Structures are given as C-alpha cells and as structure tokens.
Write a protein that binds this ligand. Structure first.
Ligand SMILES: [Fe+3]
Ligand SMILES: [Fe+3]
Lengths: 210, 210
C-alpha cells in the first residue's frame, strides 16, 4: 500500500550473526498515528519464568497467511499497515533486503507490547522459519528505560557482552535464525507508564495454523 | 591502562561500507568522570560553509604519535584515557577488532565537541589513512537533539537515505575510508545547552606533523 517506503536501503550486519537494519520505513506522522490508535487492549499477557524466559503482551493480526478475528474492526491506519505488511510489494522489499526470498512462505503477523517490567531473555529463535522482522512503532523512546534489542555474542545467560539498539519510529530489524542468532530485549524500566509497541513478522516454512 | 575494556566484542557492518561498532568500552561512571572533567575550553572553533562542510570545536591531544602541548596539565582520568588510547594494548584491541593492523602507523588523537548548531555534512574521509575511530563520551544523549552519526548511501547532498546512530557512553565506531564510506553528523538541535563530546583516533600512513 502507501504505508511502508519500499525504497529504503538496509544495513547488513555480518557481525555475530546476519542482521538487517532499516530506518524511515514510516514517517513520524504515520508512526504517531499508528501508536495513538494502537489496539493494545487486544493483546494477551504471556510469560515464562523458570530455567527463553519472557514477559509480554501479544495478539496475532495474521496466522499462516490468514487474517485473524482480532484483525477486524481496526482503525483505518492499522488496516492499511496490515494490508501493506501482508502485501506482495513489502514481501518484495523484505526479500530483496535480506537476500532470502519469502514469497511462498507461511507468514505470521503479531502485535507485541512491552510495559514496565516486561522483557525477553537471551535466546535464539526456532530454526524452522526463514526470517523474523520487528517493526518499531514508538514515536519516541526514552533513553534510559530499557526495552532495547540486545545483540548477544553467546547463549550463556551470565554473559553481559551486549550491543543494544533502541526502538526508533519506523525502524525495522530482520534476521534469520542462525546458530549464532543470540538476542534479547532488555527489561523495560520506565516508571512513566510507557508502552513499547512492535509488530513482528515471522515467515515459516510449513503452512500450519499454529 | 585500566580504562578501556580490551575484551569487548565488536559489530562488523558490511552494509554500504565496512563499519565496526562497540559498546561498553568504558563504564558509565568513567564516562561521567571524563565528561565532567572534559577539557572542552581547550578546543578551537572551526567551520567550512560553502560548496565536506562542517562547524565544530577541536584540539589535538596527539599528532603523529607525539603528545601535544594541549595534552599536558590534564585531569588524572584524562591522563589515563590518553595513555590507554595511545598504548599498545588498545592498538591491539582495535587492530584485532577491525581486521587492519595499526601498529606502525602515525596516530592522531583529537577531542571534538559539537554544540547547538554544530554539524558535519555528508562526506567521505581522505583515503590516506587506515582507520578512523570515534569514542563517545556523553553520559546521556537526548533523543531528539541531533548529533547522530549518519550512515549515508551516496555522496549526493540532496539524498536523504540515512541510518543514524546516537552517541552512547563508552561507544566506539571505527571504519576505514572506502570509496563508499559516506557519513555525516546531524546538526545538534538541543536548546538545553548540551555538548556532544567525542575523541577521534586517526591512523595515518605517512608520519608527518600535520
Ligand atoms: Fe526472538
Ligand atoms: Fe569524517
């Protein structure tokens, strides 16, 4: 559609693992529009806390290339973003950007929110999918509130060698699940009642209604 | 010395040009110590504004492996940072991190500050040096104040395809001057009287007192 800029160049990161980064996919005005109309009350709370640990809120706009019940009755701007993210034009851009062609795959689109106390511990995604892409929809993220994408250099949960990237409006991070794809989300520590808004796009190999 | 952590891993960026990124070289306590004692009043104002344009403040702690007059009478923490940045242990780390060996080269160390209105336009460094490394010494950089390292995808000054990285305490960016090494520093736009503090390390091939 008209939302995502299909001409934005990407940063290829060969560093501990393949990682692709883009900024400016959406204007600040559109991200503000999406954030103010965000269907955050449609999320469900999930958490795992015992020896990938996490605590977050989630609901799926699309599972296995099929729009969900929760994807109906959306604000116009969210209807447009879902159309664009599910469309062929964006899959073109993301397939050209990451070097993996994603066209015949089972696509999942979910809306994630992280509030104060939410986190995702160090882990590596499941190997049975081609690409995970994270779209950041916060107009402004405070600088000492956590909620940062963490590039890790090992799976040892005691390791503190980290490279962090804060959310930015219209930013997209995309990476395939490689043996080295260790990543995490630092605990959101704001106190000023802020909400970390993302949309994750998963491209699976088998077409199941998971 | 005891300042810079010689065991921090690096992010290799193969994207539009070779770029290496590291965080946590210094603790937040040391960066705060360096910033509060920063010899910013030893800088000189420089600027070029006509068709690499810039506006900034600068003075050199070291030119051609030789400590300058301005490098004397420094606070103890700045004496230690200069010793560490000029030492063999750090040149080891930076040579291993970037893949270029920097030992027999002519090293320049300068202290740069950018205030409100300061900037560096899109350009590509001179080809007669091996590596430029930028050490960021702001304890906290506000999120909408400019002063960001800009990864550009062409030399056209009308091009607005950019990937930006904000300053972080103890962060280091390092890259060789390749044909594609287009970069810039967005104009500092704070209004709250803030100072962008960096230390640049240049490794030249010829040993001249430039
Ligand atoms: Fe994950
Ligand atoms: Fe430069």
């Amino acid at each position: 559609s008209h939302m995502l800029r299909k001409d934005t160049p990407v940063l290829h990161v060969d560093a501990p693992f393949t990682l692709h980064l883009a900024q400016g996919l959406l204007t600040k005005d559109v991200v503000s529009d999406l954030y103010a109309t965000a269907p955050v009350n449609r999320t469900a709370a999930i958490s795992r806390v015992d020896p990938k640990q996490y605590k977050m809120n989630l609901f799926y706009l699309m599972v296995n290339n099929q729009r969900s019940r929760a994807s109906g009755e959306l604000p116009a701007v969210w209807r447009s973003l879902l159309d664009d993210l599910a469309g062929v034009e964006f899959t073109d851009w993301l397939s050209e950007s990451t070097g993996i062609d994603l066209h015949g795959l089972s696509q999942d689109i979910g809306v994630y929110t992280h509030v104060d106390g939410d986190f995702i511990s160090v882990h590596k995604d499941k190997a049975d999918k081609a690409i995970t892409a994270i779209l950041y929809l916060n107009p402004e993220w405070p600088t000492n509130a956590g909620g940062e994408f963490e590039v890790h250099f090992s799976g040892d949960p005691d390791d503190d060698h980290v490279f962090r990237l804060p959310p930015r409006p219209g930013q997209l991070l995309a990476f395939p699940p490689t043996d080295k794809s260790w990543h995490a989300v630092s605990r959101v520590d704001s106190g000023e009642e802020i909400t970390r808004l993302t949309v994750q796009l998963e491209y699976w190999f088998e077409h199941v209604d998971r």
